[PDB]
Amino acid sequence: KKIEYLDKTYEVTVPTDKIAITGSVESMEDAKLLDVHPQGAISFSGKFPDMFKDITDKAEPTGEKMEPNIEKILEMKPDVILASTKFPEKTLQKISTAGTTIPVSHISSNWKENMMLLAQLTGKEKKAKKIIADYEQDLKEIKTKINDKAKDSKALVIRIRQGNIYIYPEQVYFNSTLYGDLGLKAPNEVKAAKAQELSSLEKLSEMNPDHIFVQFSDDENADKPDALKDLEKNPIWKSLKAVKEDHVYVNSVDPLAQGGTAWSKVRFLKAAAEKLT
């Protein structure tokens, strides 16, 4: 069957389950939402995170997020390989010698297409279409009932990694939903960031956001599990407007969520809805 993805034709045996996912974390999360159980999946630090055990119950490791294991993939003899646009042409070419390879877009605005691609490979278009339709409808609904006080408020998303505080571009991580879909205004710092950017309590204090979504995963702070607690006990943190108004939401979404996939967006929308309304 011919598959059209991002203006490029692919020929694949479908519907299929012999899907090998490498590098494309977006595909992993779409698998979660669509309940697809791939033959090959991405391993994080040599294993499959608790958050992905639900879809890797019939899967073998394809290698780390950025180190596709060609020998393993070759062994699988998958009908299709879902790669990533993060891989250079050379790497994609190599992966191609193991089977039909589709570089799944890492760009957040392509979340509906990435979702439909997986659904077309697994014969779940109807399931996929419903999820997308519901998100748009729920989005519209949420927006109509969020009062101006929240709509014109300053909201920020920060993630703590290795004990450091990081912010992201306006169209990256959860920001595409917070500012791009919900319509809140992105602070100047977020607008200026070109990628994951280091920040600080000083900067936070500067922006003094009305709402702060804080994402903290243990696995990403192994050698500094106290980072967040230490931050919450700091006098400057306690004077922040968000903190005083109890408008700080820690891990409102699984801390390992990518941020810009159908799964991440659907989860963040609900979380945002349960906090902004």
UniProtKB/Swiss-Prot annotation:
Residues of the Fe/B12 periplasmic-binding domain: 19-277
A Pfam family of this chain: Peripla_BP_2
InterPro entries reported in the protein's UniProt record: ABC_transptr_periplasmic_BD (IPR002491), Bact_iron-sidero_bind (IPR051313)
Metal-binding keyword on record: no
Protein name as annotated: Iron-uptake system-binding protein
Location relative to the cell: Cell membrane; Cytoplasm; Membrane raft
Coiled coil: none
Superkingdom of source: Bacteria
Subunit structure: The complex is composed of one ATP-binding protein (YusV), two transmembrane proteins (FeuB and FeuC) and a solute-binding protein (FeuA).
Membrane topology: Lipid-anchor
GO cellular component terms, semicolon-separated: cytoplasm; membrane raft; outer membrane-bounded periplasmic space; plasma membrane
Taxonomy of the source species: Bacteria, Bacillati, Bacillota, Bacilli, Bacillales
Induction field: Repressed by fur. Induced by Btr in iron-limited conditions.
